[PDB]
Design a protein around this nucleic acid. Structure first.
Ligand code: MG
Ligand code: MG
Ligand code: MG
Ligand code: MG
Ligand code: MG
Ligand code: MG
Ligand code: MG
Ligand code: MG
Ligand code: MG
Ligand code: MG
Ligand code: MG
Ligand code: MG
Ligand code: MG
Ligand code: MG
Ligand code: MG
Ligand code: MG
Ligand code: MG
Ligand code: MG
Ligand code: MG
Ligand code: MG
Ligand code: MG
Ligand code: MG
Ligand code: MG
Ligand code: MG
Ligand code: MG
Ligand code: MG
Ligand code: MG
Ligand code: MG
Ligand code: MG
Ligand code: MG
Ligand code: MG
Ligand code: MG
Ligand code: MG
Ligand code: MG
Ligand code: MG
Ligand code: MG
Ligand code: MG
Ligand code: MG
Ligand code: MG
Ligand code: MG
Ligand code: MG
Ligand code: MG
Ligand code: MG
Ligand code: MG
Ligand code: MG
Ligand code: MG
Ligand code: MG
Ligand code: MG
Ligand code: MG
Ligand code: MG
Ligand code: MG
Ligand code: MG
Ligand code: MG
Ligand code: MG
Ligand code: MG
Ligand code: MG
Ligand code: MG
Ligand code: MG
Ligand code: MG
Ligand code: MG
Ligand code: MG
Ligand code: MG
Ligand code: MG
Ligand code: MG
Ligand code: MG
Ligand code: MG
Ligand code: MG
Ligand code: MG
Ligand code: MG
Ligand code: MG
Ligand code: MG
Ligand code: MG
Ligand code: MG
Ligand code: MG
Ligand code: MG
Ligand code: MG
Length: 244
RNA sequence: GGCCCGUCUCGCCCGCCGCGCCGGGGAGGUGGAGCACGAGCGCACGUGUUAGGACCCGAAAGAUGGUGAACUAUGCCUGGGCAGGGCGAAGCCAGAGGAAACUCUGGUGGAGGUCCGUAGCGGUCCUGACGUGCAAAUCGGUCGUCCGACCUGGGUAUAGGGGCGAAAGACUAAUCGAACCAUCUAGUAGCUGGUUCCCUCCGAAGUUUCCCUCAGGAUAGCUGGCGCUCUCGCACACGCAGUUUUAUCCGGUAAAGCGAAUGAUUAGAGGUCUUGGGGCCGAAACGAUCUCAACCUAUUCUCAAACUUUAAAUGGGUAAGAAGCCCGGCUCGCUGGCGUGAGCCGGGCGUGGAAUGGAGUGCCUAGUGGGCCACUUUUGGUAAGCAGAACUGGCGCUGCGGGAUGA
RNA sequence: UGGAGCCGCCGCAGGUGCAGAUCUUGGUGGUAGUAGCAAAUAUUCAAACGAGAACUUUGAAGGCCGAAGUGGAGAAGGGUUCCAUGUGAACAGCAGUUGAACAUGGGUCAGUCGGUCCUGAGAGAUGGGCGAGCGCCGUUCCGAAGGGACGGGCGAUGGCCUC
RNA sequence: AGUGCGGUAACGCGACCGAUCCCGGAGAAGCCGGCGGGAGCCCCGGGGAGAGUUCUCUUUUCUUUGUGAAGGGCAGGGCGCCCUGGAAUGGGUUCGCCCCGAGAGAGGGGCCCGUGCCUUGGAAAGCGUCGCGGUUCCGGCGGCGUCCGGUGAGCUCUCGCUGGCCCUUGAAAAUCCGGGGGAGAGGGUGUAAAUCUCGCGCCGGGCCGUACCCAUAUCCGCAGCAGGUCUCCAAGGUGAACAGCCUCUGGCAUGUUGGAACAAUGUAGGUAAGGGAAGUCGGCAAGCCGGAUCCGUAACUUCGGGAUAAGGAUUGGCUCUAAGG
RNA sequence: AAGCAUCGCGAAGGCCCGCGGCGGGUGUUGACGCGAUGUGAUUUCUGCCCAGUGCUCUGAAUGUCAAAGUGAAGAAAUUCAAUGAAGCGCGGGUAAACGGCGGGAGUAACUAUGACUCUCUUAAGGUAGCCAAAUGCCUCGUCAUCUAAUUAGUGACGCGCAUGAAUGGAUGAACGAGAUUCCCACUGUCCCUACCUACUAUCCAGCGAAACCACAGCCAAGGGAACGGGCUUGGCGGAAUCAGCGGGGAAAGAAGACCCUGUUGAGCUUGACUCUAGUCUGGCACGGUGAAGAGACAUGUUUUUUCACUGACCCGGUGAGGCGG
RNA sequence: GUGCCAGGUGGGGAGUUUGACUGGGGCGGUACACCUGUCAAACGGUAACGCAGGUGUCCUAAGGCGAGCUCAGGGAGGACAGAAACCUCCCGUGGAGCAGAAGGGCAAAAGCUCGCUUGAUCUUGAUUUUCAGUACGAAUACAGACCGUGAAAGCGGGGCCUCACGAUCCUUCUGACCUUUUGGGUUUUAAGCAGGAGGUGUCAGAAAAGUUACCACAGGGAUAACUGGCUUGUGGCGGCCAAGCGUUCAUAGCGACGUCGCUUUUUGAUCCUUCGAUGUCGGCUCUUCCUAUCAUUGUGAAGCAGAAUUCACCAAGCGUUGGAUUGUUCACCCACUAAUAGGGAACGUGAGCUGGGUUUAGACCGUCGUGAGACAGGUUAGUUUUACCCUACUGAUGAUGUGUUGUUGCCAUGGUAAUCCUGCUCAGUACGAGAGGAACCGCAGGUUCAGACAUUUGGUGUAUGUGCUUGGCUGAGGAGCCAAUGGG
């Protein structure tokens, strides 16, 4: 048969991301002497909307402590961050909203977001539109910390890394329905070509493993194993349960 | 008969540089493509069987390497475009009714994947026109939509078992259930079509057996050619038959029979064989009357491809002599009271019933392996110009006279 | 008729005889002077040129496209098709004195109009990696990736070595 | 002493030192609605020049009736620009909004666009008329005019203000400019260093394409093919309309031919007494209604609609009245 | 398509591309995200079943279990025995996974049926709803109604060959170039046809092909290879043509597509036969250093469990900008 | 994590297969390897998806000897005991049994019961059976040994005879003081020779699941779906006899139990033509033909009194309707009518029409299948090509002879055409108990058809004849024009 969709998505070139009008990479400020020992101050110039993202970004300008130059950064502004606000960053930073500081120095129970997974990767976790990670417990020896991710998972992350304080601005975005194929088209047009999703039962049996037959039925069990090959692994990928 | 090699059986004898798990020999079975005082080699010609393009033309295919996103499918970048009207969302103003609570009314306002509708986009219906057209998909009326999932130019990206698809296996340059170009490739085909001068002579088969065999091959059969071995209407013939006769056997078919067996089956008559049921005279009785289920005795009617005592006609084998008789004698390890039986020698006797034939034998070897019809017999079927058999003859392969025409 | 080679016999050899193959090439008939030259209302009179006028030209009349045009200019594409003169052999499915046909010529002038410059979607080199290999992957990734300039110091020629 | 001066200020004047460095802006931003300013075109009342009718009328019908880029001045828009002053009895104000003690009305100013008018260009040229020079060749010669105004939700273009929508936020770089600093330079009392050049003066700007068609005949469809192909401009009338119809500017000969008759069957339009779908698989085709104004509008419903539901009346011309600046 | 509901994934990850690599898309991404599904707005509801096929969880409590390694015999090739990973078996979960939802017996004061109870193959046996449906062979089921007449339409009944609950059931406003039935007006659809117009067709001036063609062409019967233009017997036949016409030429158009055969293919599916990419697991090498601990042989050898270090190797950031005492 | 092995998963992907016979193919069966009786026509041989059947086993004895008896059944008897329990006598040609299906064969056996046994052992050939005179399987006499049994003759190397079974290659076991193991010697191992086994049931022997309506190719009328051809079981129709129905009375009208025929208007049966194509159903239109006559004309018979209605003859001349439903062929219903008879012409008729439902490709539902998919199950939307050729026909010029022309005509031949009904009088009469209820000739007219014609009426209408008007244009009036014929 043909190569199925999803299997065709790996090559790209029609399925790549629409990264034309996006305003850059939303990354934390990298670690240095000021991040490690003290704190350096920056100003929030403006807040911008990034295409394909439900969260607004914030242009934050710092002064470079080694060369005379105003360094700008792309943070994700917490809900409540206004322009003209002094965002501090480092180890000695005070605990308030929009003030990135390490998890080993913050008290536990702190609602944080834009969390680093490994120390130094400029912010990876819990930073979509309204999500937040919580700090459960610390550990003085070996510098480890327990962090609850917004999926309910509970992860051992080292205490050396940092996160901005608060929730991601733009919460409640999924509470409103789309109401239109047009609004869903405009939503995914800024992201990537993935929205018109033909069900594989309605397809011919040569471009999908569920197509064919005089009636639109699946025919085989839709729950497939993890050890399934490419072009076959279609349906419910290694389902533990499947019902309501 | 004899000999060589392999294998099997029964037994003994001979020789040594090394006396042995040595080597050789006898007789009798049996297998070999052997010997038995050679016949091959080399070249050329004809035919047949093959491998090769293989008599010629022909596929649906498969693989390898490249070319296309000028059409179309989708994503991105940059530009362009979309009259005039209808309904009147939020917000806002004013008035009226009442107590706030509030409720109506008149405006303003211009939202909608809203409505009519132009340009644009597309193509429902007339299944209209045309249908060797204007056109390898157009035209007219009627149409759907026309501010958002809209239309469109240029640039660009995705390339063939790949792409792309609001998903029709649709599109991918008039080519898509796997594009196009070139090569392997003159791919293969038990399958269709065709196969080129004359005359003479001979001349078929659709059948046996086997094959994943049923449109085909192989093998026998039918056929042609090349020959050989012999005989002679030159005073002087051994053998052979789709033939008959003379003797000798075989049958179990037609017919006939079942007063004979097996199976079916009709009706009277005479006998308590022997019980029993509906029964009638009787408490009952083989005491009188008959009945049928199975009883007997002689009779009587109709049968049988898978019954038969009998039993034809047509048929099938044999013998009609010299390869036959009559004698005398050797051999035997078979059998053996002497004897048998078989094999070798030597000698003596020729028209072996009718008519007709000149016979025997060895190589190659094409085509065929779809048949059909008719007298008689016969299976299945209501029957068939139906299907399937037996002998024989025809058509096929064959004209000619007749049946008006015509296998 | 033709104008330059050819045949009989003995032998050898072959790309050696056509009526077919929806055979291959070329040519020609019936059909047949037939189908047809019928989508978007329409032409008419007089004169000039000529051998020749329904189609050329001029004048007049009547019409059509009706400013989302049958108008005036560009892009892609075509490449001389643009213009003048002459011809009417072939083409303009009738004709033509006409044409985008033929034959001679001629015509496109830029600091300001565009390309040229930049970058977008993207393409594509060096390093690096992969691959038997033509090469392929990738555009910051396993890079010593700058060839520039101010102020000062040394040295040197050129121009009236002062500058 | 002297790298300028003026204003309360927004800022202005013809220049008005300045580096490596840093910061910022322009480049550089969606779609739609509404309003306002300006232009081009259209309309009306006239005045001039030339053409048409004038069998009757018509101070009449048609054409024309202007000024480039580049500087200066002034109208006209916009201001989220500044000063005085502090407002409820709330005010100003738009089509709608909206604004105001974080400073509204009322005064006084300032900046930007000024494509509009005048002005240099510039009336010499262009146009419309009348009359001539020259046999011809001849880019001519002269007499006049190119004027005064107003309206409009008019069509198109441009600029500005404001609002709506987005689970859409609507591009980069080349290049140019401004600011913060003060490394550094200047001459020492008539000169200089400087002039992100204030005015003038001098030289140069190389290479490539430039014609025509652009579409019922110059392109692609085998062709002068009823097909396909991206755009700019858009007159008058009727009319809601850039719908349809007629006309002006411009264009053409009816689309690979004409003549004579009007047979059948065709193709495309129509019309039919009486019946109204009885025809046919099937109201297929055809036919009825249709614009606007005034009434009126059911069931159901997601309370938005249905809905132009269904169903009635009117529509011409002429002469007036009243209202709308 | 929005709405609804699932599944996987916390980055040495999920899905996927790639001959290849510290390769690449999602990713300028981070559970309100990405990838794979089913159903298809609103309301309401989504019953029972894990026996089967799938998917998934742990388990030295373990049947099967390859290679490498361990021990025993021999002169060795070789053989034997124990150990024996993942996966299959065993045990839970899972139906908005694929799917399935039948029979038998007893039982109610008329009969009938079964509210109730037990069992089967195999796990429950069709729940709420709905229907002669687009779904019902019988069938044109039965009744009511629409008609003069209805195999059509609508409303009810359920005995439903063979309806049924996200393989979604039911209802439902608006919408539909979707499919059916009736009614009002309307009309040549028809009774039943008629006439007019334009372009053709007709003739003419000029120009002018193409399909097709064994020979060509009047019929009745007979026979034939079983429907003759030709043969036989009859009927008979007479030059050259024009406009129509559709009866014939089993007219043309294309080596029937239907059905069959071929030891001919191709697209697809899987519980067909062989394989294979990917993926999971085990062994050897890259692969080092220390700590305690358990087991086996035996009076040093092997299987090893976890932790600690970086020095190989991997990941992240930077303009490798302050790392350890 | 990489490199290399090992194990699981694997239609994500690749290659390939999906037997044969067959009154077309699938389904159903094996007629695919064998055996008996018949077919089978008196040697043998002989076919069909001809008939009845049977087989892929079973037997340590059911094999091999020797001995003794007779079996099944019947009659007669005997306590329980009867029809069948056990004992005895007689008859008893096999009418029982021999493992099975059938046939043949058999009486001191080939059966039953005993006693002993393993000839059911090893090794060469020859022959028969299907046959090509090749195998395999089975069998037939023998030959050499070793044996069993019996007193011996002899019998026996499997089953009383006809079936009970299997190549190459590979593997396994057994046997020889067997050969080789490639320089020589030993040993393990391996290869050889022969015999047996592990099996090819499609049985002379590939290793093998489906679907295609998205399909393709080479062919076939060797082979179907249509029509045509033979037959007529079936469908329809007509006779022969005559027990009865009919108040008596077989035959006015019918007619059982039986039997003889016609038709291709129905379905069957066959495969003879066509698969280098003969357009596959209905309906619309239109023409001709048959009679097996519904009505009309002329008649005969009735259980014909009249009316009405049945049977039968000559007879196809003229008629056989409008609709609701269904695609319908059929069917049923409403109404009219004299009557609403049955059929054929390639199941008349697609270069005549339509495309309604079969019968492409898109879809939805139900059943089946894991699936792709299938369903004379239901629904929906689905391009209907060409005549200008020859003939036939409809019309039109014409043509040959009459010396040429014109007028007037005749005529062979060919076509043919009229049909049916209502009202009045007869007549409320004939007839009849009554109810009811005719017929002939006349009179007035209608239905269908045919041939004409436009006085009237209706339609058409571009005399573009004449008014009325919408928009635009010629300066206005007048006169007009365009708007594919502006409209009325
Ligand atoms: Mg589909
Ligand atoms: Mg698949
Ligand atoms: Mg199913
Ligand atoms: Mg060849
Ligand atoms: Mg050859
Ligand atoms: Mg070939
Ligand atoms: Mg292949
Ligand atoms: Mg269509
Ligand atoms: Mg059509
Ligand atoms: Mg035509
Ligand atoms: Mg399909
Ligand atoms: Mg001869
Ligand atoms: Mg064959
Ligand atoms: Mg016999
Ligand atoms: Mg007999
Ligand atoms: Mg043959
Ligand atoms: Mg036959
Ligand atoms: Mg030669
Ligand atoms: Mg020739
Ligand atoms: Mg003509
Ligand atoms: Mg034309
Ligand atoms: Mg032009
Ligand atoms: Mg020219
Ligand atoms: Mg010409
Ligand atoms: Mg103010
Ligand atoms: Mg130009
Ligand atoms: Mg133009
Ligand atoms: Mg017009
Ligand atoms: Mg015309
Ligand atoms: Mg003309
Ligand atoms: Mg033209
Ligand atoms: Mg009428
Ligand atoms: Mg009807
Ligand atoms: Mg209609
Ligand atoms: Mg309504
Ligand atoms: Mg689901
Ligand atoms: Mg459920
Ligand atoms: Mg389960
Ligand atoms: Mg229920
Ligand atoms: Mg109806
Ligand atoms: Mg109903
Ligand atoms: Mg169900
Ligand atoms: Mg269902
Ligand atoms: Mg013929
Ligand atoms: Mg015809
Ligand atoms: Mg064929
Ligand atoms: Mg074909
Ligand atoms: Mg075969
Ligand atoms: Mg092959
Ligand atoms: Mg293929
Ligand atoms: Mg398998
Ligand atoms: Mg496969
Ligand atoms: Mg294949
Ligand atoms: Mg077959
Ligand atoms: Mg015989
Ligand atoms: Mg005995
Ligand atoms: Mg012996
Ligand atoms: Mg015996
Ligand atoms: Mg299908
Ligand atoms: Mg089918
Ligand atoms: Mg045949
Ligand atoms: Mg037939
Ligand atoms: Mg009959
Ligand atoms: Mg009687
Ligand atoms: Mg044909
Ligand atoms: Mg035909
Ligand atoms: Mg008669
Ligand atoms: Mg009808
Ligand atoms: Mg027919
Ligand atoms: Mg026809
Ligand atoms: Mg047709
Ligand atoms: Mg149809
Ligand atoms: Mg279909
Ligand atoms: Mg003609
Ligand atoms: Mg006559
Ligand atoms: Mg007038």
């Amino acid at each position: 048969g043909r190569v199925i969709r999803g299997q065709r998505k790996g090559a790209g070139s029609v399925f790549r991301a629409h990264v034309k009008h996006r305003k850059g990479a939303a990354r934390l400020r990298a670690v240095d002497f000021a991040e490690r020992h003290g704190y350096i101050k920056g100003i929030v110039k403006d807040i911008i909307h990034d295409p394909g993202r439900g969260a607004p970004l914030a242009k934050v300008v710092f002064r470079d402590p080694y060369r005379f130059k105003k360094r700008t950064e792309l943070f994700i502004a917490a809900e409540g961050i206004h322009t003209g606000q002094f965002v501090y960053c480092g180890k000695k930073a005070q605990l308030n909203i929009g003030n990135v500081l390490p998890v080993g120095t913050m008290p536990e129970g702190t609602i944080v977001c834009c969390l680093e997974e490994k120390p130094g990767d400029r912010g990876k976790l819990a930073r979509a539109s309204g999500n937040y990670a919580t700090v459960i417990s610390h550990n003085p020896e070996t510098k480890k910390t327990r962090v609850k991710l917004p999926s309910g998972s509970k992860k051992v992350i080292s205490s050396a890394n940092r996160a901005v304080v608060g929730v991601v601005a733009g919460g409640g975005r999924i509470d409103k329905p789309i109401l239109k194929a047009g609004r869903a088209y405009h939503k995914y047009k800024a992201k990537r070509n993935c929205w018109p999703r033909v069900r594989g039962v309605a397809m011919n049996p040569v471009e999908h493993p569920f197509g064919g037959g005089n009636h639109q039925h699946i025919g085989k069990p839709s729950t497939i194993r993890r050890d399934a090959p490419a072009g076959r692994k279609v349906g419910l990928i290694a389902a533990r349960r499947t019902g309501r």
